[PDB]
Amino acid sequence: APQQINDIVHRTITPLIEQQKIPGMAVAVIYQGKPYYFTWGYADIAKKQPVTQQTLFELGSVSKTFTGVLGGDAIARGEIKLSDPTTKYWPELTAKQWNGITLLHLATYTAGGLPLQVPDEVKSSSDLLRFYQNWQPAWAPGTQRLYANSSIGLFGALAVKPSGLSFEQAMQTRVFQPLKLNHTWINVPPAEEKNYAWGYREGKAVHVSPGALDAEAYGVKSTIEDMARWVQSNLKPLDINEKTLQQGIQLAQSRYWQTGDMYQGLGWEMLDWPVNPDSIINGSDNKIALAARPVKAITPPTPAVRASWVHKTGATGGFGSYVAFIPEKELGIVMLANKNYPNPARVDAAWQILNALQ
Numbered sequence: 430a431p432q433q434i435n436d437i438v439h440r441t442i443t444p445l446i447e448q449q450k451i452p453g454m455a456v457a458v459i460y461q462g463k464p465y466y467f468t469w470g471y472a473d474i475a476k477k478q479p480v481t482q483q484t485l486f487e488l489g490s491v492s493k494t495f496t497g498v499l500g501g502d503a504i505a506r507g508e509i510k511l512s513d514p515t516t517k518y519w520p521e522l523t524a525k526q527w528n529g530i531t532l533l534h535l536a537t538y539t540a541g542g543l544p545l546q547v548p549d550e551v552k553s554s555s556d557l558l559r560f561y562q563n564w565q566p567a568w569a570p571g572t573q574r575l576y577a578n579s580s581i582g583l584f585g586a587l588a589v590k591p592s593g594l595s596f597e598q599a600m601q602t603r604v605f606q607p608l609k610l611n612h613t614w615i616n617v618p619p620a621e622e623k624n625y626a627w628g629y630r631e632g633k634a635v636h637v638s639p640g641a642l643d644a645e646a647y648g649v650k651s652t653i654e655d656m657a658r659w660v661q662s663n664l665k666p667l668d669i670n671e672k673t674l675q676q677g678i679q680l681a682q683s684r685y686w687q688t689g690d691m692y693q694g695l696g697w698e699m700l701d702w703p704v705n706p707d708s709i710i711n712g713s714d715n716k717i718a719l720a721a722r723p724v725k726a727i728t729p730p731t732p733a734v735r736a737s738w739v740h741k742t743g744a745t746g747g748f749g750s751y752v753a754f755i756p757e758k759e760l761g762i763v764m765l766a767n768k769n770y771p772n773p774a775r776v777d778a779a780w781q782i783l784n785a786l787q
């Protein structure tokens with residue numbers, strides 16, 4: 430890599446790893462389109478396995494970007510539309526509060542206060558139906574944003590219904606394969622287990638446990654190389670051969686709602702570039718990110734703006750990830766770690782890297 434990039438990356442990540450006590454980390458910088466890779470530390474402390482460019486990390490909520498793009502692709506195919514009532518694809522959702530709640534609301538956390546997590550007590554598909562049927566909205570549709578796995582998770586599950594494919598099959602055939610993400614998985618295959626990092630939570634080695642709508646909301650695992658390709662694909666959707674996928678990516682980066690300085694896409698979140706570093710850094714803290722906030726409708730949505738900071742924060746019990754990119758600049762970063770360390774530290778590091786290179 431160019432010395433400039435190396436110096437910028439190392440001066441930023443070294444003290445981060447030290448401050449946060451991160452066991453293992455992989456970083457990719459996309460500079461003028463190309464990828465440059467950096468790795469530190471351990472995928473498995475016990476077995477002394479280093480982080481490599483082939484190491485799989487749990488993406489956590491960064492998985493929502495894939496869900497958003499897969500959803501976008503389904504819209505491009507004419508299989509669904511964001512203006513459809515939720516009941517169009519789940520007719521058993523007959524309870525009256527579901528009148529007026531569309532796929533858009535589900536995809537953008539604006540249904541009216543669906544909870545962050547699906548209750549752990551939900552074990553069966555009958556349990557899941559009951560949960561949504563009995564759920565009482567705090568607010569009218571499209572008035573408040575509340576970040577929720579139970580919201581985008583349901584969107585993901587319903588978006589693939591007309592296809593007649595399972596969520597995993599749809600994701601694999603329509604997103605992973607066309608983009609050549611051959612080491613990106615919802616379920617890690619036995620063949621790839623050797624590369625699967627352990628997450629670390631309070632010193633303990635952990636992997637994400639099964640849960641309702643896990644695949645749709647937080648269930649993707651990936652390598653630093655595949656995530657770099659994912660950034661490249663989102664930076665330049667036009668170079669993608671598969672028409673509906675190209676359009677899906679653009680739909681995902683469209684601006685549907687505004688809250689403060691931020692815009693809600695499908696999975697992706699965006700801010701106007703140049704950004705105020707304090708608004709991305711402070712805004713990434715869960716104090717703000719997980720809070721219920723009033724939204725202003727963007728009527729109609731603004732097509733993907735190239736002058737944007739597009740990004741997504743993501744975590745599991747044992748992992749912390751961050752992806753950010755600026756289409757206008759052909760510039761991006763992926764940060765994957767096997768520790769959940771605070772969002773603002775992630776965004777601060779990303780800012781100081783991308784700022785230095787722009």
Ligand SMILES: CC(=O)Nc1ccsc1C(=O)O
Binds near residue numbers: 557640641
């Ligand atoms: C629909 C789904 O994700 N599966 C489901 C529903 C209730 S529990 C559960 C699971 O996967 O554990």
Ligand SMILES: CC(=O)Nc1ccsc1C(=O)O
Binds near residue numbers: 517518590591592593
């Ligand atoms: C094939 C299939 O799953 N179709 C289905 C299931 C719930 S809604 C829907 C559709 O095609 O609209």
Ligand SMILES: CC(=O)Nc1ccsc1C(=O)O
Binds near residue numbers: 490491647742743745
């Ligand atoms: C897996 C999951 O629910 N992640 C979660 C919960 C609150 S913030 C967050 C994330 O992935 O950033």
